[PDB]
């Protein structure tokens with residue numbers, strides 16, 4: 001089961017966010033973004049993603 | 061900054077396909093920068109890459125991808141899939157808002173409470189004799205007056 005972090009929007013299967021530490025994770029989220037290359041990605045810069053991986057845009 | 065390409069996929073297969081492409085990208089070190097599967101776009105995902113052939117290559121062997129539109133998508137046309145901010149952000153108890161969509165459209169109300177976790181706002185309508193709290197989606201309101 002894939003939960004999004006409300007604070008930095010990373011997606012994680014576990015019970016705390018592995019990027020910011022938050023426990024505030026939601027099973028409820030929409031719009032999957034995957035950032036492969038943080039340095040080169042205009043998506044990443046636009047959403048302010050710093051770490052390669054799965055993110056949700058809308059965390060609800 | 062790569063360019064944005066639309067990739068045709070089987071309906072219902074957007075996220076699953078993004079994820080399979082991502083797996084292959086990682087295995088072969090493909091120069092794909094990002095991938096985006098908006099929940100509001102059905103049958104297409106977007107892949108950010110330096111050029112179109114890098115996407116054509118990445119989708120080979122991927123069962124549910126059907127091809128890459130040749131014409132790149134300007135960045136502005138994906139930006140509206142990219143806004144992480146709850147529509148309720150900035151609303152405070154006492155603010156005055158208008159409902160702009162849905163059954164309560166045109167009606168004005170006072171903010172009781174925001175739930176940014178769910179992007180909802182609890183409101184009391186201005187004209188109501190009985191002030192019952194109504195919770196509306198954050199997108200359906202617009203601020204008229206701060207308190």
Ligand SMILES: [Zn+2]
Nearest residue numbers: 005008017020
């Ligand atoms: Zn986080």
